[PDB]
Nucleic acid binder design. Structure first.
Ligand code: ZN
Lengths: 191, 136, 52
RNA sequence: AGAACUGGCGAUGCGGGAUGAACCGAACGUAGAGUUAAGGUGCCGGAAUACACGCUCAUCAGACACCACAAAAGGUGUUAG
RNA sequence: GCAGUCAAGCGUUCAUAGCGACAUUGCUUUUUGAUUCUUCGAUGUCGGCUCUUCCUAUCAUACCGAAGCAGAAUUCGGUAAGCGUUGGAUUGUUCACCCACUAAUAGGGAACGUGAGCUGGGUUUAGACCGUCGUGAGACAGGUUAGUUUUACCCUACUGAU
């Protein structure tokens, strides 16, 4: 029905800074720098009082209005990722075969290899995306920790681990094997 | 061959198509074997399924004891009489075509083998090499 | 050992889903319409069967 | 396949429906000028890539009577009630 | 012949895993009818052999989804025609039924593909026999046996070659 004016606000905290060049959002904070290309959405940014940013859509349809809210969420995810960080935690579950995962290095890429998954002799390799820091957890049995700034790079690298250890030609309800997300949190403490 | 035999066999030149009559080389009582099929044989238009040394075939007894006739039974070819080449470049052949009656799992119905057997048949069927006296 | 503390964590992505009656697609549990265009985004959804 | 009324084709070209004996327009001496019919005006193709309000995105969109096919049933696709 | 809609019921309980009555909506032109538009100054008629290509309503192989899927084996469904889909006894057979191999022995179109490509076993002249019918000559979508398969050097197409 072509909503004349729909608008969402973006709250920017103390330490970080946001710079936009005609759609190119650059969020720079204590943990680093994040850049995103949003040139496929066609929204309008405006700075109000150096602590709040407003995004406006003029004469947009229902689908185009639905693309307004995802703009604010993507920028907020970029903002919270450079102050609080993003920390994904997984657990290894197996019935008989202990899954062995180690950090390897070929051609300077820091792959993640998986061994002894359901007794398979094949070594599945998972490449670590840039910005994601992989660390093995302490005092918890079979836990891996994925940490980084970009939520869409930590979770996608996380999704690669979850989808590489699939079970085929068996009953999924019985063979409870895989690398599953346990908790999606933040890197910084107290929050 | 197929099921029953462990290990792989190099290709031996085909000399026994469907309808060939080969002598019975063991003391099972049969006199000859009539090949009607070859186990593990491919399918091609107008192409006759042809057997080689060491292959498992379906054969019927045409002469011999009346208890062994008019029924389908597995058989294993031990002599070919058609010249075939081994990996070591030697072309060899026997005088006649010979077979032994066996079960699908590869155990011989008979107890002893008369005449020589091929080397490729001996290492593919343990129950045939144990009953043979001379290998090539 | 199943360790039910990890069974429900594994059951989140394995059995606690939904099945479309037409295209057999695996769907989120509390979804009402299938995400597949080939069945016309139908609403005939069923819970995923669990082992006995 | 067989009747009723009327108009046509057969006996009929012309403009239109890309194309067609029947449909639409209109029926024909030889020429000129002007205006239109039916049908069209992105290019092939002569004529506005005119104006105005909306609807539709289709991983087999749709596009014009006769006419060269599509239904029951469905869709938190979108729009209006 | 093939595919949907509705869901009374079957399914140990549980309609929709799988099915599915009573009804109802369609699709296909590989069946058989109906029609008589084209061809009776002739478009060579069944089947097989041979060979090419196409269709998907998928038998197998590839990747997946679902199950009353533990494993194994199967079942149902999706993307899919890329690549394969046989050797024989009987019958002229199409069709069919058995033997057997195989991952599998899926269904069809191309003037019911293909006779100046073949074959002539079937059908359908003239010879002859039998049965039934007819006074008889003769009749039989009844059985049986014997019975000439012509021509390219033209144009195009295609294969190679100047
Ligand atoms: Zn669906």
């Amino acid at each position: 029905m072509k909503y004349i004016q729909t608008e969402q606000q973006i709250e920017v905290p103390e330490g970080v800074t946001v710079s936009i060049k005609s759609r190119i959002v650059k969020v720079v904070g204590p943990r680093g720098t994040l850049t995103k290309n949003l040139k496929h959405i066609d929204v309008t940014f405006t700075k109000v009082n150096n602590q709040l940013i407003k995004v406006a859509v003029h004469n947009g349809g229902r689908k185009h209005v639905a693309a307004l809210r995802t703009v604010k969420s993507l920028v907020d995810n970029m903002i919270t990722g450079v102050t609080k960080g993003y920390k994904y935690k997984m657990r290894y579950v197996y019935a008989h075969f202990p899954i062995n995962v180690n950090i390897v290095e070929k051609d300077g890429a820091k792959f993640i290899e998986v061994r002894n998954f359901l007794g398979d002799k094949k070594i599945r390799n998972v490449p670590v995306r840039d910005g994601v820091t992989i660390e093995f957890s302490t005092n918890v049995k079979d836990e891996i920790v994925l940490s980084g700034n970009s939520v869409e790079d930590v979770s996608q690298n996380a999704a690669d681990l979850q989808q590489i250890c699939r079970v085929r030609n068996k009953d999924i309800r019985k063979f409870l094997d895989g690398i599953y997300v346990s908790h999606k949190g933040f890197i910084t403490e107290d929050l | 061959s197929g099921n029953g035999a462990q290990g792989t066999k190099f290709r031996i030149s085909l000399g026994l198509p469907v309808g060939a009559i080969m002598n019975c080389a063991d003391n099972s009582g049969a006199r000859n074997l009539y090949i009607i099929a070859v186990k593990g044989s491919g399918s091609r238009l107008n192409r006759l399924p042809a057997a080689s040394l060491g292959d498992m075939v379906m054969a019927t007894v045409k002469k011999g004891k009346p208890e062994l006739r008019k029924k389908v039974m597995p058989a294993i070819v031990v002599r070919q009489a058609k010249s075939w080449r081994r990996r070591d470049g030697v072309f060899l052949y026997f005088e006649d075509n010979a077979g032994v009656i066996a079960n699908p799992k590869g155990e011989m119905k008979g107890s002893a083998i008369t005449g020589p057997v091929g080397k490729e048949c001996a290492d593919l069927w343990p129950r045939v090499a144990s009953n043979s006296g001379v290998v090539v | 050992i199943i360790e039910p503390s990890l069974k429900a964590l594994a059951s989140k992505y394995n059995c606690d889903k939904s099945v479309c009656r037409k295209c057999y697609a695996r769907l989120p549990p509390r979804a009402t319409n299938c995400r597949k265009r080939k069945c016309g985004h139908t609403n005939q959804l069923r819970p995923k069967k669990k082992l006995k």
